[PDB]
């Protein structure tokens, strides 16, 4: 149960979906949730240990630029806070 | 023939936002060399002696 | 078939007509009709690799001219199992 | 604490960076994340006036370079009673 | 049981045999029909997966364009309707 | 399926990473890894034709800059029944 | 048939695809794969002289581009009876 | 310890230099030494993705200037099951 | 975890700032708060390789200007068991 | 609040006159004085984040010339519970 | 039991334990002591045979100079006498 | 047995066996391996005491380079890891 | 141990003090105390390789500053089987 959180922003559902696929393929990390932000923004949220999350996020960012609209944001959270956890299904 | 890391690193920007990884960016004893008249066989590292800190100690 | 084809478009009308194109071009079953937001609509179909590839290519070639046209059209050959709850 | 630290951004990677910085900087209780519509994501925390100020400063400095970026580094010190039903 | 139908008509039985040989040497396609339309038109009917059918039919077209009088058209259907199947002889 | 794809490279790291791409991009069974000799390493995959070239997809653009690089990526639409003893 | 056909190529990609060309091209049985060394890979087939001749032609023009190219090709109709240990 | 760290070089000198750099710099497991042929030499370690990353950095920065030097240093983020039996 | 990260600085204030950045930067447990003497203060954190690496980099490049400044920043990944007396 | 403010000086008399400024400027209670070694002396005050900031401002502005002078005086509004063992 | 006592001291525990890890990795020797002399002088004390001690201290010098303020003293003793042994914590 | 590892790699085994002769003539080192890397690379493993292995490798690097094509790669290993032993013939 | 350590010098104070260092540094057995004539005096000790190494280190480093000085410092890790009959 690696607490490190990766999460990727995409304009459109496509890049989000292959972003999640790349997340899973690059490393055996778990996805905690996909969200339809609205206005075409779709976001993928995955959990795992810090290094695996970093590798997976890098792979997804690599694989999403060309397909669809591409990336909107991509960054790694190493230690999500307890106060952010209620935003993740309290 | 015989004339790069290939990792999570090659993601250009990537930037999860919170995550940085910004800490990467990377003879005295008792007369070891004093006895350098010593004739034939010796300790130390004249050359081609990898594990003596040269590119090793890092 | 675990092969996953999926198409994004700007408008429900091109989405559903592309779904019909998917279904008549290839004998595959679709699983998702999602409203992304802001007019973006996604369709999710399942089948074997060749069938979904041919179907998606046909739909992409027969969908660009209707409504606002395509937004994206990509397929995944062997999607990860843990992706399943996401759809 | 009664003071309110309260922001939008476009896409919520900078939103979680803002919330994470909220926690890193000062004591603020994350009372609400909300999808305004069209991609605006608003974060809402409660805490001490100075704590809210420092946390919001940090969140603004940490969220703007990521993604589309910040929208408003705004704070209210007294959320008056009639505002609370909107919270 | 391959649902994708590859199927090709040509002028003369020699190009038809070219096409069938290319079918059976190209991919996982099972030839299901060899019929004489009349007036020299001969059609070959094979079944298989979409990718296999595509590759096999294109190989047949390559092997058939020059032999004899040659083919006139190459055609592949991906998700055929079950109603069309009796018209093929089931 | 029984469609046969396979890839070579000058080295074992590009070969094994290409095999990783084979089994990750598409669900194709991996049947062999062979050392030709003098650095030529090949890897053999079987499956659906679309799935076969679907495996080759990721390998081709994953092993080009790894080590000495890709050597050959040609695939077979179908091997003959007596090719297997030589496999 | 005792007629011999056998060809050499750099890398096993052209080797196997040319063996496939031979076994779709004429009545030849692949009696040998040999990793000669230094990337050289050779295929040996029994067969009738006309068949094995057509097969060696097919293998020759199969990998003009496959892999990095041919190395050699020819035909033997009657090897000596004592060359079997070399076979 | 599913992360698969991996090094190639020319000869065992940089190879075992990389190997003991692996096992001494980080607390990870070396699973394999292989001789590709033609001078290319193969070392395979397993461990946590961060631990594997640190180890491979250590070896790649320690073994390049000894002997003929490094050739292929690369690691796998999420290795697939299918390749492991072929290891 | 078994990975040890650890830093000195001149002055206790930068030391605790660095350890604070340790304990929020990544999931890590800190084990040592040692007064070297003459002003050197050492912080010892324990965790897995990726977490300790990221945490140490963040704390170091955040503590460079804090107070008098840091001392050293390099981290070992897989410490030998023999460092038990350092506990 | 929960904020911990810190002061560092070359010697303890400036440090504790700064601590007097701490506890006499704002409603903040100091939890500790620590002699680092080699003359470095730190004082750790506890209280509300705004109070802590104002107190630290006052002490730093008071104690530039006192003794040999200041070294470090920065604050964290939310030091971790994990820092408490270091407190 | 390698009676040879190698030992080195430096500025702070980062270079000290980096040299310790270098000694225990490059050589198979047992370190016996970590001492705070005072004023930054921190010392590592290891036991081993003469060749192993030599290799360990060479590795420590190589890996310790480029970290922190660096190593200071890097000499060893090959055959420590019994009377020094109580000074090693007996 | 002295775990200290000396290994010398050369192009062709004439310099490899010159290095081995320097090994077995210099110090108490036993050659534990004579292996052919592939493509002409020949390398030799000897094991012994740290100083003995160091002196032996010194002699090899003194008498190996100018023999035919000569030395290509040498080194010393001070305290080899336990997990390396499987790669050393187990 | 069959390693031989040897020192030549001009006089006996250098010889005897060098031998005292010889035996004090590590366990080595003095075997030869030979007066060459013409002022040359030599000491030969027996011990294992590392012991002789460090011992002759100490012996030279104690003897250098006596008389005209040490003339030759030399050791062998193992003399041949055929040297000692004329020891």
mmCIF file of C-alpha atoms in Angstrom, chain C residues 2 48-51 53 75-79, chain F residues 24-29 48 50-51 54 57:
data_model
loop_
_atom_site.group_PDB
_atom_site.id
_atom_site.type_symbol
_atom_site.label_atom_id
_atom_site.label_comp_id
_atom_site.label_asym_id
_atom_site.label_seq_id
_atom_site.Cartn_x
_atom_site.Cartn_y
_atom_site.Cartn_z
ATOM 1 C CA UNK C 2 -9.990 -8.099 -24.137
ATOM 2 C CA UNK C 48 -10.076 -8.885 -30.658
ATOM 3 C CA UNK C 49 -7.126 -6.809 -31.832
ATOM 4 C CA UNK C 50 -7.713 -7.012 -35.574
ATOM 5 C CA UNK C 51 -11.461 -6.480 -35.300
ATOM 6 C CA UNK C 53 -8.382 -2.001 -35.159
ATOM 7 C CA UNK C 75 -6.809 1.450 -29.168
ATOM 8 C CA UNK C 76 -5.092 -0.688 -26.537
ATOM 9 C CA UNK C 77 -4.198 -4.256 -27.476
ATOM 10 C CA UNK C 78 -3.871 -5.904 -24.040
ATOM 11 C CA UNK C 79 -5.167 -3.431 -21.445
ATOM 12 C CA UNK F 24 3.051 -5.228 -22.079
ATOM 13 C CA UNK F 25 1.655 -3.545 -25.200
ATOM 14 C CA UNK F 26 -0.333 -6.625 -26.238
ATOM 15 C CA UNK F 27 -1.265 -9.952 -24.661
ATOM 16 C CA UNK F 28 0.956 -12.203 -26.772
ATOM 17 C CA UNK F 29 2.569 -15.347 -25.410
ATOM 18 C CA UNK F 48 -3.174 -12.971 -32.836
ATOM 19 C CA UNK F 50 -3.196 -7.849 -34.780
ATOM 20 C CA UNK F 51 -1.883 -8.781 -31.348
ATOM 21 C CA UNK F 54 0.620 -4.894 -31.599
ATOM 22 C CA UNK F 57 4.554 -1.748 -31.906
#
